[PDB]
Symmetry: D2
Subunit: 400 residues, 4 copies
């Protein structure tokens, strides 16, 4: 299970002061550059760009492809923060999001036209935890000269999945999650594979083909070759729109990256064990996790993930007797179970070293019985023991 | 000079640990909140929002007003980065920037239609340091139901000018400059006056009057009344597009604010004394600074600024013999003066406590003789002596 | 009023990235070195050393001179924490502190013996704010081959007093106070004049004259000449005993240093004005401030202080009716006034930009009527008004 | 391998903002408080104190036991910096360090007298990695009423050893090393088991028995019972002597602790494998690591360590021809091996996630051939391959 990734996450971008300085300066960012190269190296990309958040990394990524009058094609299985960004905020920019339920390859193609500037996927989709069929979707997007953008947040900076290996062109990360690993720092990363042939599609992507008025009349394809996309995103979009990552955030996230494979491995082993334990528990109706045999999209998971199946799972708790008669929400077995955990923390992030839970129906396909768990790196027996005592307290004196 | 500003910059938002904790967390920003409240109070606004840069402040401020198909109307006296942002970047979003030379208010009205969603000004415009006629431009924009957005970066956090006092609706700052004060930290702020009556223009500004699909069906005008703009910018745009200020940035900027009035006063007084001296120098051909009586906009400057005239001036250095015959740039007198400076630092920021100079034709009204100076809070005799010794070097073996 | 000091506090040690990096590194401090060189220049010293606290700066400074069996001679007008340090902690190290009273030099001579390794002064002593007669005490210490160590904390980093200019050998600072300026960061500085002739006293100070076994047999006097003291303190004491300043602290203190003269000037000016105003107040029995003619050591203050008289003052509030008939402490006017302050903050620090108060008799001569103010840089009229409204409340229904 | 240590390292001290705020304040440290409770829980201690560095932790730890005229008794197998501290700087304090070669209990006893205030040991001693016989040495120390102080730095925060379970009284750490884990942050920890019965030695330890003049006449043994040591060290020594830990360092170290078990396990496993590999190399003359069967102390090591044998090893490289005629020491083989390493970094720290090497003859038992290696958590094959390619280069064109 140890591999070269362990070396890369400590050395890529550090060429020759051993720790990298916080260049807290406006004027002459080396700290962000190390981070960028390291995540590039871990993803199997050519270059990367750091921005102030996951949401910013997704925003710039798409705005570097699509302009007013354009469209993008996305899975409907969206991290809920991405869904509003797409359907609502992007619409105010004249960018139309088109959603393909299920991920039959020919369903994608039926909404393609010449104004389609990206296909957008998530490595592990919220909230059915389906892994996309990267090869089929990439073949069909590339056939029509459309680049593929993948949110690989749940791939933990490349540890569980490197979608560039399966043909993805652009990868985005909420580094806020597993890359940082400690719930201290918000950040995003955009990674360019450097393999999408912009030159073949000068009319679809004029931003790389035509002199850039905003950058000394540079033709990005001529001046930067295969890095045209990421250079344009840096020199025009980041410059003009300004979601830059603070060097202190760059520093903290570099600290996390140094232990990424160790943390992620443990997150995955703990999540698979917790998911298996929940599934056999008499308190639980169902569990959703990509590493369970019972998972529908397990075939893709097995093919495209490695070293495990991600840090996150969902499960439903069985009802208290008199389930639907109870007029009060908070008194339902899901919210109760969350309120009685002592180890797990009730809050909305994922990718902390600490185990985190949320019961969606009660604050933020959301049923009342549903608990989402970002599984931490605590001792698995204490994690399980925490759920068990919560179940016990909630179903107090009353078989499961 | 001392005023209640001195008290506010230390106490607004810390009404109730004596220093403000850096809450480097993702999950449950309070440092950001103190900064926002403090800049709001100094500018006389109702509320504010901190974001990752000045560029982002301007981007979100406009994107909270204008959607694709809309237009905005702007002075053409723009900060370099605002120009490309407006001309090139906003165009990709379907927002048309209409530029209007001079500060005749009839030039503004000329280019209004009912899809005009903002008028945009700079308190002290670049590169000629023109202060606009706030009263007249506001009057005419408000007549047509159009809100006025003012980049008050050169007003130093409200110290040299509070555009809201003259009817501005929205104020944006590069907090990177004088607010921070030390060249360490990038950051932006948006300040809402809360005096623009969104309710009276339900169709020009649908984002405040129609149910927000991306925010639980809320009608911002109904739920948040006079704070509809700023709440929308926060809960929709900031959330979806993601240019968040890091808490370490919030923290350092808060430290700068606490001395803003002390610093800005000294920047003002030093700039004026440098300007007057350059105006008597045999080595100078012209000087541009709003507090000089010879400046074309000296009247507006006197009426809308107070406590001084800002920290930035430009001047032209006398030509050396063979100036147009000279083919090589670096031997032009401007580049040579900048090269021989010892105290001043050659870089592009403004608003550092250190004095900074740039000869924009020899790096980035961009004529060959032109030196721009952001005048620092060094002892004035040391700043002057620095220019003097360089002039002497550059022009040696001649007659001043 | 402005002087070269304003240039020095921005430029010294920044030799040739505009801001100084945070080198958060164990291995290869540069940030620290800038702070050191800058405070040395501000104090007219040859070199300096940064350490984790004012208490650490005092400890190492003394342990750089005195060993077990030795004594030092100190004013008894000690900041509270220095007294315990000296009388109690130093004793466990076999260093005996001898406390001399008043300013008279002859009393100094009487307790001097061949094992006296230092004389210790404070620039403004607690809590009577008496300034020492530097010239007489230095003359009589130097006659006996004894160096003078001065805690110049209340000197505000050289702004109000540079004791080295009156012959002091070694100056220490709690940089926690005026040097940082914001109550955020704890730190200490030791400054060496480089002017004490260690070579003339090889027996009194063997640590500079005998091969140092702890440092490869170096004789500090030969290898480092006039810097023997500070090099010995760095390379032996800091190394072995370990009170090192973290580079983040170094960074924040440097930011404060950049406005030192502006803050200190305002603190001094506001304290004098407050002091005068309290004196004429009929709620006030007495006022102690070095810049009042009423002060007993006024003449030392005017000879050795410049640009003002420090940031700190004490005063007595007149008794309420039933003065000695109150056996409840908290009903006395002193405590009542601090509780009804709205702008001032009640805590034990000095040197914050904000106004700080304490009634030491009701938590930390220390009489029942006494309030200690560290006067901030708020608008003076707001500070005064805060006292008045407090007075009026406490004395409501009763004459001044 | 995974255990409860994994939960404790995440949760101890964070009872109920999910991330710990950085309280950068001088006035009212909770960040340090979390780190102290955590390291105490990981060591099996009652309480702990954070200080500016490991050197400071060792200094205050001893100064809280021994006063002028006292002695302590110490292994001779000391980390370099400790030896100078003990032999030289402590002597200036009137504390005599009595060094006891070897690890026979009885040799400790022969230098005990009634002024012996500590026995000081190291978990893995330098420079030959000997583990002391804890049980035997604690029994003879405690028989004479002497507390045992253990530098457990190389125990990695309790992961490889918890000396308190073997009867140690006080444990110190350089948290600079594995606790922190990234070479970013300097710090120390003192841990008190709360088991040493101070009340039975009121004259050997008057600091806990006699009213404390430096702290309100308190008798630590009465007011604080079994926590008298750690409270006296905090409220008197830390307060007067001032080696405070900055909250930024607290925060960074807390982040490191959250991955301690995962890092330390990989360090231990990587060192053992590198050790074994070195043992099959034709370029190596000897290897020293506690986990090898050939190590002199292998039995103590097996008894008192667990989960591995620590992260550091040393070895000696064969000479190149003409050792003795070489007059440039950078042309010797140990130096050349270090110079040709690509992955390993040449510097003095240990306990970084990166592999570090030093050949101490060429910089800081120190012989020509010695390389010390702090083995990092890179992929072991990369680490081995680095040494191999280095040997291949240095000894190119030769017999092996
Ligand atoms: C958290 C998250 C995001 C948004 O990231 P931020 O850094 O919080 O802006 C987007 N993608 C995935 C799948 C996420 O989990
Ligand atoms: C610097 C500047 C900007 C841009 O702000 P950043 O914080 O550098 O993104 C905006 N307008 C003015 C006038 C500024 O000087
Ligand atoms: C605050 C103070 C000290 C102690 O400094 P710390 O940085 O608080 O350890 C010493 N001397 C003076 C006069 C003080 O004001
Ligand atoms: C590094 C170290 C120390 C000294 O700690 P610092 O944090 O460098 O002051 C002492 N003991 C051990 C064994 C060491 O490894």
């Amino acid at each position: 299970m140890p591999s070269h990734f362990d070396t890369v996450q400590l050395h890529a971008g550090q060429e020759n002061s051993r720790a990298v300085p916080i260049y807290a300066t406006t004027s002459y960012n080396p700290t962000s550059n190390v981070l960028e190269e390291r995540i590039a190296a871990l993803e199997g990309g050519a270059a990367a760009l750091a921005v102030s958040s996951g949401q910013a990394a997704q925003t710039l990524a798409i705005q570097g492809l699509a302009h007013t009058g354009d469209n993008i094609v996305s899975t409907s299985y969206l991290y809920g923060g991405t869904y509003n960004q797409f359907k609502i905020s992007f619409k105010r920019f004249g960018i139309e999001a088109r959603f393909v339920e299920g991920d039959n390859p020919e369903e994608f193609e039926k909404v393609f036209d010449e104004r389609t500037k990206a296909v957008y996927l998530e490595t592990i989709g919220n909230p059915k935890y389906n892994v996309p069929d990267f090869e089929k979707i990439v073949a069909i997007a590339h056939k029509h000269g459309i680049p593929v953008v993948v949110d690989n947040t749940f791939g933990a900076g490349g540890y569980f999945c490197q979608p560039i290996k399966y043909g993805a062109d652009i990868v985005t990360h909420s580094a806020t999650k597993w890359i940082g690993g400690h719930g201290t720092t918000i950040g995003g990363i955009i990674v360019d594979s450097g393999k999408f042939p912009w030159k073949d599609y000068p009319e679809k992507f004029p931003q790389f083909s035509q002199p850039a008025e905003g950058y000394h009349g540079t033709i990005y394809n001529e001046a930067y070759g295969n890095l045209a996309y990421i250079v344009h995103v840096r020199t025009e979009l980041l410059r003009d729109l300004g979601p830059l990552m603070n060097p202190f955030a760059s520093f903290l996230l570099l600290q996390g990256v140094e232990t990424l494979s160790l943390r992620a491995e443990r997150h995955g082993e703990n999540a698979l064990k917790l998911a298996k334990w929940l599934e056999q528990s008499p308190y639980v109706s169902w569990v959703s996790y990509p590493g369970l045999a019972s998972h529908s999209h397990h075939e893709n998971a097995k093919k495209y993930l490695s070293n495990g199946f991600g840090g996150v799972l969902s499960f439903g708790v069985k009802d208290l007797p008199n389930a639907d008669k109870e007029t009060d929400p908070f008194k339902l077995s899901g919210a109760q179970v969350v309120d009685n955990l002592k180890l797990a923390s009730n809050l909305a992030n994922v990718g902390d070293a600490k185990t985190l839970v949320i019961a969606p129906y009660f604050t933020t396909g959301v049923t009342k019985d549903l608990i989402r768990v970002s599984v931490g790196i605590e001792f698995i027996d204490d994690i399980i023991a925490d759920f068990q005592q919560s179940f016990e307290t909630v179903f107090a004196g009353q078989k499961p």
